[PDB]
């Protein structure tokens, strides 16, 4: 369990922080390291053992830690920092996790933040007679391109049967994405509602449907 914000952004040259929270089983008693995965390439080591900097890690990067939460800090935000950042914890000699973060996408803002417009379609009657149920969440016109999709039955979180795409760049230089929830007709008509919750830059949009 290393929950970590999907999106972090700021104007050029501004300071930024990334959080990395979990339980006590991972960093309640261990060490945390950070990694930078840039688009179209493999991850690099950024920071290891809470706050140690390699030679070719710019001094703008710095790590911190407290309780069951780690924190990476970036100063003078620039294009070279646009990438995917993961925190990691290898307390392996005993237990697992053993796990990486979520993690976070850094973005230098070229325009104001745009929260996503969400539309949720229920299963078609044509599909239900084929003994199949599929809800469709359509996420569009958001910036920066990174969202968190959480599906709900009543209020229970469901994680089984979810398929979510990675964000894609629209023609208007914004982003889009879609999430599919596979279901059985029983489960569909059993619960009084199903919801599609999208979090983005601290804000959240929610849509719901029912039989």
């Amino acid at each position: 369990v290393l929950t970590q914000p999907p999106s972090v952004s700021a104007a050029p040259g501004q300071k930024v922080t990334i959080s990395c929270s979990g339980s006590s089983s991972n960093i309640g008693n261990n060490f945390v390291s950070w990694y930078q995965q840039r688009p179209g390439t493999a991850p690099k080591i950024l920071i290891y053992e809470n706050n140690k900097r390699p030679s070719e890690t710019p001094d703008r990067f710095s790590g911190s830690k407290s309780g069951t939460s780690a924190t990476l800090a970036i100063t003078g935000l620039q294009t070279a920092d646009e990438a995917e950042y993961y925190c990691a914890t290898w307390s392996a000699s005993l237990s697992s996790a053993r796990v990486f973060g979520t993690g976070t996408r850094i973005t230098v803002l070229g325009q104001p933040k745009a929260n996503p417009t969400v539309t949720l379609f229920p299963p078609s009657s044509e599909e239900l007679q084929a003994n199949k149920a599929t809800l469709v969440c359509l996420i569009s016109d958001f910036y920066p391109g990174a969202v968190t999709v959480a599906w709900k039955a009543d209020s229970s979180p469901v994680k089984a049967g979810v398929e979510t795409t990675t964000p894609s760049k629209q023609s208007n230089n914004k982003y889009a994405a879609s999430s599919y929830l596979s279901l059985t007709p029983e489960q569909w008509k059993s619960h009084r509602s199903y919801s599609c919750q999208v979090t983005h830059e601290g804000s959240t949009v929610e849509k719901t449907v029912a039989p």
Binding site: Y86, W90, S124
Partner: protein, 243 residues
């Protein structure tokens, strides 16, 4: 640090596969080695790890007793034997170097067996943090072949209407391979059209959906048809979407 993964490809569930990693420009036999995977495009997932001498091994629970890690210090190569593959294992597999330069601090007091060498009793151990990374080798696991899409309508309704405009679309589900063309009313309807990129499901089959926004006043008088074409399966469908 140079690391080169190899031995990935397409295989059906239940079959096996042997990955290799060629290490160079560092004292390979002094460092532990890690295998980690990354599905396109989710987060990182640690798979396995092995100590510098290969006596201590580690495996995640998802892969336990199904995957097995090994190494050959003689040839500076790392291996990962993957048996009984599943579609859940579909990912890009990286090998990674461990930061810690390990050493033997305590030996046993008898040779083995034969070969006349002394096994190490106690070591510093794996750190275990991933210093260097390779480019990764891609592994696909699915019994998915050519297959035509099932097209279901995404009907308009109160929940899809706002400000006089209504949203309606089509769901193109479970097809392989890529791509599919989706248009509306034989190309007459272009304004307000938005075709989202497909999702690659665990089954190895693709699914997408095309949605269009229209005046809700046009419903009942204007007909809307989504024209799907998947040339590989030679399927051409024109599904009429209605309330």
């Amino acid at each position: 640090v140079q690391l080169v993964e190899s031995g990935g490809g397409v295989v059906q569930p239940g079959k096996s596969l042997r990955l290799s990693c060629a290490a160079s420009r560092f004292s390979f036999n002094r460092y532990g080695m890690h295998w980690v995977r990354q599905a396109p495009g989710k987060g990182l997932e640690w798979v396995a790890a092995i100590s510098y001498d290969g006596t201590d091994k580690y495996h995640a629970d998802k892969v336990w007793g199904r995957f097995t890690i090994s190494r050959d210090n003689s040839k500076n190569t790392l291996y990962l034997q993957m048996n009984s593959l599943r579609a859940e294992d579909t990912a890009l597999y990286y090998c990674a170097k461990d930061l810690r330069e390990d050493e033997c601090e305590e030996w046993w007091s008898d040779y083995y067996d034969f070969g006349k060498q002394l096994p190490c009793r106690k070591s510093r151990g794996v750190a275990g943090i991933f210093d260097g990374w390779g480019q990764g080798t891609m592994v696909t696991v699915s019994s998915a072949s050519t297959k035509g899409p099932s097209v279901f309508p995404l009907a308009p309704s109160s929940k899809s209407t706002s400000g006089g405009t209504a949203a309606l679309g089509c769901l193109v589900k479970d097809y392989f391979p890529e791509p599919v063309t989706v248009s509306w009313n034989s190309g007459a309807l272009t304004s307000g059209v938005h075709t989202f990129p497909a999702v690659l499901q665990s089954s190895g089959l693709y699914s997408l959906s095309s949605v269009v926004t229209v005046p809700s006043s046009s419903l009942g008088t204007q007909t809307y048809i989504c024209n799907v074409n998947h040339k590989p399966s030679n399927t051409k469908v024109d599904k009429r979407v209605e309330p």
